[PDB]
Design a protein around this ligand. Structure first.
Ligand SMILES: O=C1Cc2cc(Nc3cc(Cl)ncc3Cl)ccc2N1
Ligand SMILES: O=C1Cc2cc(Nc3cc(Cl)ncc3Cl)ccc2N1
Ligand SMILES: [Cl-]
Ligand SMILES: [Cl-]
Lengths: 122, 4, 122, 4
């Protein structure tokens, strides 16, 4: 018999993104080639099958630095990290291949699905 | 607020 | 020119609640009288003006235990913690006074607003 | 997916 506040989940994500932009309570650095991205482990886990697996590992759960596979493109990762914290995906002709490859590696099934759809249309 |  | 995934914020919150239920990456215990509640500091901050203030404090940000005011009712807190992680509020005749008082203390303005509305109707 |  609960009532529900429609905008609650969006408002929570908006505040988590504000914490990220201000580097508040970030507990991990994701290294992608020469580039570094600060984030919250819980948000990464909630969005990605790969980070979910990494941070549930009894040894990796305690690491403050995670290095991604050298094939991963920093821009593709940046676009996906922004999507995790906003629900908004900056998908463009020039980045779609790098975004799909990064989403497949990160195990972000809904992003992979829209990339496959957008590629098929062109 | 809604009835979910 | 971004695209948006409508269910993303809700799916993120659902996964954060799954992490909470399994006690994964919880980093704080909230003590309410004899009762203890494990949670994620970032989720508490995103939902509550009080926790936002506590965990942005340069000293309190590092505490693993937070003790609430002894007037706070553990059931009212439990109902509000559930709302934080689900968007669902278990508001009932028998708990509405304790829920409103706890939401005022936690600075959860939208919960305070619906409690004031539901009380006014009766 | 939508146009926000
Ligand atoms: O495409 C995706 C997105 C995703 C997210 C998560 N994260 C969780 C899943 C569960 Cl069941 N409980 C808790 C968490 Cl944080 C796992 C796999 C995938 N695949
Ligand atoms: O009723 C409410 C709910 C709430 C949430 C937060 N938390 C934040 C606010 C901002 Cl601007 N950036 C980041 C965070 Cl985590 C503060 C006050 C209140 N009042
Ligand atoms: Cl996804
Ligand atoms: Cl609220």
């Amino acid at each position: 018999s609960c009532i529900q506040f429609t905008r609650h989940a969006s408002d929570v994500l908006l505040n988590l993104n504000r914490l990220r932009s201000r580097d508040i309570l970030t507990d991990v650095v994701i290294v992608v080639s020469r580039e570094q991205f600060r984030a919250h482990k819980t948000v990464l886990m909630a969005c990605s099958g790969l980070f979910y697996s990494i941070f549930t590992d009894q040894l990796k759960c305690n690491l403050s630095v995670i290095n991604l596979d050298p094939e991963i493109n920093p821009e593709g990762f940046c676009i996906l990290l922004d999507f995790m914290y906003t629900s908004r995906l900056n998908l463009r002709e020039g980045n779609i291949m790098a975004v799909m490859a990064t989403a497949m590696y990160l195990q972000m099934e809904h992003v992979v699905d829209t990339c496959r759809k957008f590629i098929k249309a062109s | 607020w809604v009835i979910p």
